[PDB]
Design a protein around this nucleic acid. Structure first.
Ligand code: CL
Ligand code: CL
Ligand code: CL
Ligand code: CL
Ligand code: K
Ligand code: MG
Ligand code: MG
Ligand code: MG
Ligand code: MG
Ligand code: MG
Ligand code: MG
Ligand code: MG
Ligand code: MG
Ligand code: MG
Ligand code: MG
Ligand code: MG
Ligand code: MG
Ligand code: MG
Ligand code: MG
Ligand code: MG
Ligand code: MG
Ligand code: MG
Ligand code: NA
Ligand code: NA
Ligand code: NA
Ligand code: NA
Ligand code: NA
Ligand code: NA
Ligand code: NA
Ligand code: SR
Ligand code: SR
Ligand code: SR
Ligand code: SR
Ligand code: SR
Ligand code: SR
Ligand code: SR
Ligand code: SR
Ligand code: SR
Ligand code: SR
Ligand code: SR
Ligand code: SR
Ligand code: SR
Ligand code: SR
Lengths: 194, 92, 237, 56
RNA sequence: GCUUUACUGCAGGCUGUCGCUGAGGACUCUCACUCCGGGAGGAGGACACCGAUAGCCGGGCA
RNA sequence: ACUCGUACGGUCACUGAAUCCUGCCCAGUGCAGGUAUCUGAACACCUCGUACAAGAGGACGAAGGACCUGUCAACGGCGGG
RNA sequence: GAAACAUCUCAGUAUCGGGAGGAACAGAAAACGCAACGUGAUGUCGUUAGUAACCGCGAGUGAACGCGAUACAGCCCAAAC
């Protein structure tokens, strides 16, 4: 039969219809009043969290984050930039809101590494994302056959280097064949034409 | 100058002499499904566009002749070399 | 060009700011629960450097020393009442509903309990007119009819220090001395005596503005000089 | 009063002093910030890529 | 460097529209959201703010 | 920032003590108000077109412009016959 | 640079913000599509090729599949129960 988890997954397919609609109207009232990064004991989406790698273990942290909405908070030109390089409100950035969210969250927790993240909704002025974090130094994770990879020296600050699942997706590394000549092995190696 | 409506002349898509109707050529409505029609939608962005950053041009104190010569038996049209016509009136 | 004077203003540098540290008090109203059981004796009448007009030092029933805005006539020894059922005497603070019609009032509030916003300057007043269950119309010093909430507090009487603007400065020395104590850059150099690089009316071989003085309300900061959105200009005609 | 030699008379102020962190006479004692190593401004050391010719 | 009814663009203002955003071509409500009060609670109310787009003005700026 | 400020205020401009005065013009440019009617973008709606998309027309219509009024201590003007 | 210049070029170069390691990144196909009865993770070297592609179609910009080589390596969850 179906898993109890599959009933949260099926609910989040439409986060504006029914029981979840009335839930998110309520929650966001407290979330708007909550900080930038708030550590929360239990995730909002169990299926998604577990799917991404979350366990109910010692040293597996989850934290909600809220980033401003829209495009870029881009100013104007002080020095002589042409007509083409004069867009203030019409241009956006190259890192999606989920990546900023993951970074803000990894800096709030300078010892924990980012596992993965997901969206927990949005309103007119902000976007919320919940980020799963892991403690690399906790022996509860050092001897875990499903999570001990994150304890390697080369995995240090993995979000900032774009080695996150959310990172590789923004870097244009999803496709294995066509239209991924300029993106693999890295953008920098390909001169930044990604 | 004046130039008749129906006159007996040649047509390379007929190989003989039939009565050709002299009609003014009406252009055609733009659907926008061409090569350069998409360049105005893709290649265009914030501040200046070169060739897309222009306005329609002018003329000479006389425009040429853009005519269609549809015949009697087949009704085929040949694109004849256009002369600098001041005002053209088709007799009858 | 360069940023005009009004652009350098908003930055909030020393030159354009007010010497706040040299100012006395943020003259507001007292918080009574409901009942008017608060009263106070005026002990002193001081000078306010922030707003030139006199300011009364009031000690209350519970010994709370606060500087209140001074209305005409009120002196040392006098008792005033702050609350809901206050006396209709000059200098008493009470809401608009409790104040009768055709009475000159001052230190009027916009939203109830904000501490006073309207009618505060040297010698001004406000006329209370209509009384409904919902609205209390007040005529502000400019002649504007403000449809106020009857729960908005106000002090009965005209402000003290009247007829001040009726006497000239005589010398620039008197203006200098005044402006040093306010949030203003002084003197005022006309935009026309400036260079083209410094103001929209600058430049030229003589003195005159380039374009007409009247400017659109949609004009950007740096082009908004002269007569801002004039519905007309001139005296007669 | 000319901007040259006579204006050089009013020069009895101490600004740049020996730094604690690096030791160059670049600690602005009025700003408490170093102009050479960046002590008092950054936790890191003030280094810049233009302190050397591009491809070096 | 500077000027403008030189060229082209950008800020910025004004305006429609989509999201925020709810209940019963004109209107009622309160529940989001905003503001004010220490608090109780009071004002405003799906407008406003903000994200997006569209037309006008636009030497303030390049 | 103005602002511990509230129209007897502060903001933006112009003229430059006092004294005696400061005429005429709102056609153009500016600013502001109004506007039956014209013009007016995208969205949504309507018709045809596409197994869908592209796409052709229509309907509606904001600011704005047209257009009318106000204004020169507003830019300015006060000639020839 | 385009013999000016605005799209374009210089060039994702300079410089700036963040972060890892002795290397980094990539990686076991929702691939390739020498269309096949075919190849079979990923880098890199040679070649493909100044080709295809782009571009006031101007100046200029410019891959890939394949092929030959170097080295080879393949696994773990989520859920079901
Ligand atoms: Cl991390
Ligand atoms: Cl013709
Ligand atoms: Cl003054
Ligand atoms: Cl093959
Ligand atoms: K350029
Ligand atoms: Mg590499
Ligand atoms: Mg200028
Ligand atoms: Mg000052
Ligand atoms: Mg006060
Ligand atoms: Mg002056
Ligand atoms: Mg001069
Ligand atoms: Mg003069
Ligand atoms: Mg003048
Ligand atoms: Mg508040
Ligand atoms: Mg210029
Ligand atoms: Mg003078
Ligand atoms: Mg006059
Ligand atoms: Mg050149
Ligand atoms: Mg390019
Ligand atoms: Mg050329
Ligand atoms: Mg290129
Ligand atoms: Mg290929
Ligand atoms: Na960290
Ligand atoms: Na494209
Ligand atoms: Na110069
Ligand atoms: Na006129
Ligand atoms: Na040249
Ligand atoms: Na040149
Ligand atoms: Na070109
Ligand atoms: Sr393009
Ligand atoms: Sr353009
Ligand atoms: Sr000609
Ligand atoms: Sr207050
Ligand atoms: Sr106040
Ligand atoms: Sr001038
Ligand atoms: Sr007059
Ligand atoms: Sr001297
Ligand atoms: Sr000195
Ligand atoms: Sr500092
Ligand atoms: Sr550095
Ligand atoms: Sr005079
Ligand atoms: Sr006029
Ligand atoms: Sr292999």
């Amino acid at each position: 039969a179906r898993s109890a988890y599959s009933y949260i997954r099926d609910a989040w397919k439409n986060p504006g219809d029914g029981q979840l609609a009335e839930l998110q109207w309520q929650r966001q009232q407290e979330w708007r009043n909550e900080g930038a990064v708030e550590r929360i004991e239990r995730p909002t989406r169990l299926d998604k969290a577990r799917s991404q790698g979350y366990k109910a273990k010692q040293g597996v942290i989850v934290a909600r984050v809220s980033v401003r909405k829209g495009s870029a908070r881009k100013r104007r030109h002080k020095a002589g930039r042409r007509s083409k390089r004069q867009g203030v409100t019409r241009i956006t950035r190259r890192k999606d809101i989920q990546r900023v969210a993951e970074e803000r969250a990894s800096r709030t927790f300078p010892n924990l590494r980012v596992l993965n993240s997901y969206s927990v909704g949005q309103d007119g002025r902000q976007k919320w994302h919940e980020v799963i974090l892991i403690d690399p130094n906790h022996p509860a994770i050092q001897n875990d056959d499903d999570l001990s990879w994150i304890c390697a020296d080369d995995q240090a600050d993995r979000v900032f280097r774009g080695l996150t699942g959310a990172g590789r997706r923004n870097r244009g590394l999803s496709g294995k064949g066509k239209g991924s000549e300029k993106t693999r092995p890295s953008l920098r190696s390909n001169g930044g034409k990604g | 100058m004046q130039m008749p409506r129906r006159f007996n002349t040649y047509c390379p898509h007929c190989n003989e002499h039939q009565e050709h109707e002299v009609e003014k050529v009406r252009s055609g409505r733009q659907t926008g499904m061409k090569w350069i029609d998409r360049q105005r939608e893709r290649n265009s962005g914030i501040g200046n566009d070169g060739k897309f950053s222009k306005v329609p041009g002018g003329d000479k104190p006389t425009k040429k002749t853009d005519l269609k010569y549809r015949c009697g038996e087949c009704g085929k049209a040949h694109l004849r070399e256009g002369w600098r016509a001041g005002r053209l009136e088709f007799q009858e | 060009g360069r940023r005009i004077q009004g652009q350098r203003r908003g930055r909030g540098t020393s030159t354009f700011r007010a010497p706040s540290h040299r100012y006395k008090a943020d003259l507001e109203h007292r918080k009574v629960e409901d009942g008017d059981v608060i009263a106070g004796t005026v002990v002193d009448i001081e000078h306010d450097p922030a707003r030139s007009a006199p300011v009364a030092a009031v000690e209350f029933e519970d010994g709370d020393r606060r500087l209140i805005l001074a209305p005409e006539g009120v002196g040392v020894g006098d008792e005033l009442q702050v609350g809901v059922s206050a006396e209709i005497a000059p200098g008493n603070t009470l809401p608009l509903a409790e104040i009768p019609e055709g009475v000159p009032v001052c230190n009027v509030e916009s939203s109830p309990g904000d501490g006073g916003k309207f009618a505060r300057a040297s010698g001004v007043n406000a006329q209370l007119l209509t009384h409904d269950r919902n609205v209390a119309v007040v005529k502000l010093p400019s002649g504007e009819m403000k449809r106020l909430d009857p729960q908005c507090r106000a002090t009965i009487g005209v402000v003290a220090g009247g007829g001040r603007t009726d006497k000239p400065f005589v010398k620039a020395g008197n203006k200098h001395h005044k402006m040093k104590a306010r949030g203003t850059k002084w003197p005022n150099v006309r935009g026309v005596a400036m260079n083209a690089v410094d103001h929209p009316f600058g430049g030229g071989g003589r003195q005159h503005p380039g374009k007409p003085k009247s400017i659109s309300r949609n004009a950007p900061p740096g082009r908004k000089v002269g007569d801002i959105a004039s519905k007309r200009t001139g005296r007669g005609g | 009063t000319g901007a040259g030699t006579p204006s050089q008379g009013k020069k009895n102020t101490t600004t740049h002093t020996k730094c604690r962190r690096c030791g160059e006479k670049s600690y602005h004692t009025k700003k408490k910030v170093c102009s050479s190593c960046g002590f008092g401004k950054s936790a890191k050391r003030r280094d810049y890529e233009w302190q050397s010719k591009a491809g070096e």
